[PDB]
Amino acid sequence: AAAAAANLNAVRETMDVLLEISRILNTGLDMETLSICVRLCEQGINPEALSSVIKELRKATEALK
Amino acid sequence: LIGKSINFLHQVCHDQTPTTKTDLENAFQGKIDAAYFETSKYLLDVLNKKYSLLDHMQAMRRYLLLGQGDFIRHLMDLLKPELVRPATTLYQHNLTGILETAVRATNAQFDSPEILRRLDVRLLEVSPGDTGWDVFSLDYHVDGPIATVFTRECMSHYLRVFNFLWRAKRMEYILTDIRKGHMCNAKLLRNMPEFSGVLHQCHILASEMVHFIHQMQYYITFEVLECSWDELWNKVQQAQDLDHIIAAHEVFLDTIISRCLLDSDSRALLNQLRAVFDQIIELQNAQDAIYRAALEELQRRLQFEEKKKEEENKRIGEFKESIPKMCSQLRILTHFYQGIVQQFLVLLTTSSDESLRFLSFRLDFNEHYKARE
Amino acid sequence: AQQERDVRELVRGVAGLQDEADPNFQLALNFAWSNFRFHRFLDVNSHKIEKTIEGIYEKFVIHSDLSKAASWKRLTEEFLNADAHYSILSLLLCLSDSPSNSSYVE
């Protein structure tokens, strides 16, 4: 509809404010990977799990060095 | 004001003395000012002795504002290996013992034990900077009724000024490591007139930095810690209200915030200052990278004769590869430094009209700049 | 369903493995899912996350970074108005928290 797209615009705003919070603490995530990590937390999953996983997968690409 | 003061004196300090004493043809302005004088005199008496307002003020300049300096240098000496590692593997039980050791070794031991107890360590969240050296603080904790003059916003100011006076108090000791390195290493190069060019050029680059970090550490003391101290000391020793003592303390700390480089407006100045601290910590590694190649050769050259009691020909060849690249690095480092500090000095003249400008007048009394500017 | 595609895209993005027919892709994926299913953490404490946010603000004001302090407060106060909040915050916090002397560009 129109108000059914206004909610997703107001979610796009929250993704942008999270896009600023992600860069000022100097994380590695950018907008496209960040959308993945928020869609996972929509289902319900530990942040303490996902954080250790991305802390490993970023080191799992300099092990094909 | 009187009804407020006699209620503070009851509800917090719990110290008291029984029995205090058409218009009314001027009976207000006799009763009110008589009572005001009496209330304020006893209040100031007991606050400066039963909870020692003055002791806290004396230990907030010596320690937080670095008006001591034996205590601080012994602490920095013992806390160097703690600071060099990232603070995720640093915990508070390692801080408090090193603080204790410093206190016993340094001048602090002769002071009163209460204020030494009220000084204690803290940590910042996870590891500010990851270099390790930004992560530490000293906080003086207050738990008496005199918390009302050491208000919750002014502790933040104390920690800001301490933060700046921590970084600069490290960098000055890093440059005297540069000078200490010159004074020892150049006495081995009294037998090698090949490194003497680059070794000399380094000696001069060092002295150009040494002076400006000896003008900061004097301009902070005889204008920001000696006008400000006299101003506060007068505005306490005269004052006939606690409400005047508070509002003198607040602005004295605010003036230290403006004259030091801690405003949001002086961020442009602070950037230049961080970039000249950059060069100081850079110069250490660049300096040792010489001696870890140059000086190492000579001991091996002596051991070459020790075995005899073509290889060393390759080391003579290595001299002609080492020395020019060392000089060419030192040249661009020197010129980049002179340009960046000159760019600071021209900006320094206008952000404030007299105070910040004065450093630029103190620093050059040769007019090396304007013939380089 | 979308969760599985997300975990695939997370492997592709973070680990830099854009070919699902690489065995290293399937190994990293099996690792990611086995990590997710090994329940070993307490659930997120919103109060501890709030205390950590305010201490970050305190660290910004202690270092006279006023624009970063004001932006930190404004962004976190805005975001915390319409559980998963404190999740994403703790996530990013553990993840790097490599905010140095600068790291700002706000």
Curated annotation (Swiss-Prot), chain A:
The keyword ATP-binding does not apply. One of its GO terms (cellular component) is cytosol. It is found in: Cytoplasm, Cytoskeleton, Microtubule organizing center, Centrosome; Cytoplasm, Cytoskeleton, Spindle. The keyword Acetylation applies. Required for the recruitment and the assembly of the gamma-tubulin ring complex (gTuRC) at the centrosome. The gTuRC regulates the minus-end nucleation of alpha-beta tubulin heterodimers that grow into microtubule protafilaments, a critical step in centrosome duplication and spindle formation. Associates with the gamma-tubulin ring complex (gTuRC) consisting of TUBGCP2, TUBGCP3, TUBGCP4, TUBGCP5 and TUBGCP6 and gamma-tubulin TUBG1 or TUBG2; within the complex, interacts with TUBGCP3 and TUBGCP6 to form a luminal bridge with actin that stabilizes the initial structure during complex assembly. Interacts with TUBG1. This is Mitotic-spindle organizing protein 1. The chain holds residues 11 to 75 of 82 of the full protein.
From Swiss-Prot, chain B:
Keywords: Acetylation, Cytoplasm, Cytoskeleton, Microtubule, Phosphoprotein. Ubiquitously expressed. GO terms for molecular function: gamma-tubulin binding; structural constituent of cytoskeleton; structural molecule activity. Its main location: cytoplasm. It is found in: Cytoplasm, Cytoskeleton, Microtubule organizing center, Centrosome. GO terms for biological process: cytoplasmic microtubule organization; meiotic cell cycle; microtubule nucleation; mitotic cell cycle; single fertilization; spindle assembly. Component of the gamma-tubulin ring complex (gTuRC) consisting of TUBGCP2, TUBGCP3, TUBGCP4, TUBGCP5 and TUBGCP6 and gamma-tubulin TUBG1 or TUBG2. TUBGCP2, TUBGCP3, TUBGCP4, TUBGCP5 and TUBGCP6 assemble in a 5:5:2:1:1 stoichiometry; each is associated with a gamma-tubulin, thereby arranging 14 gamma-tubulins in a helical manner. Gamma-tubulin at the first position is blocked by TUBGCP3 at the last position, allowing 13 protafilaments to grow into a microtubule. This is Gamma-tubulin complex component 3. It comes from Homo sapiens. The lineage of its organism: Eukaryota, Metazoa, Chordata, Craniata, Vertebrata. The gene is TUBGCP3. The chain holds residues 485 to 890 of 907 of the full protein.
Swiss-Prot record, chain C:
Widely expressed, with highest levels in heart and skeletal muscle and moderate levels in brain. It is found in: Cytoplasm, Cytoskeleton, Microtubule organizing center, Centrosome. Belongs to the TUBGCP family. Component of the gamma-tubulin ring complex (gTuRC) which mediates microtubule nucleation. The gTuRC regulates the minus-end nucleation of alpha-beta tubulin heterodimers that grow into microtubule protafilaments, a critical step in centrosome duplication and spindle formation. Component of the gamma-tubulin ring complex (gTuRC) consisting of TUBGCP2, TUBGCP3, TUBGCP4, TUBGCP5 and TUBGCP6 and gamma-tubulin TUBG1 or TUBG2. TUBGCP2, TUBGCP3, TUBGCP4, TUBGCP5 and TUBGCP6 assemble in a 5:5:2:1:1 stoichiometry; each is associated with a gamma-tubulin, thereby arranging 14 gamma-tubulins in a helical manner. Gamma-tubulin at the first position is blocked by TUBGCP3 at the last position, allowing 13 protafilaments to grow into a microtubule. This is Gamma-tubulin complex component 5. It comes from Homo sapiens.
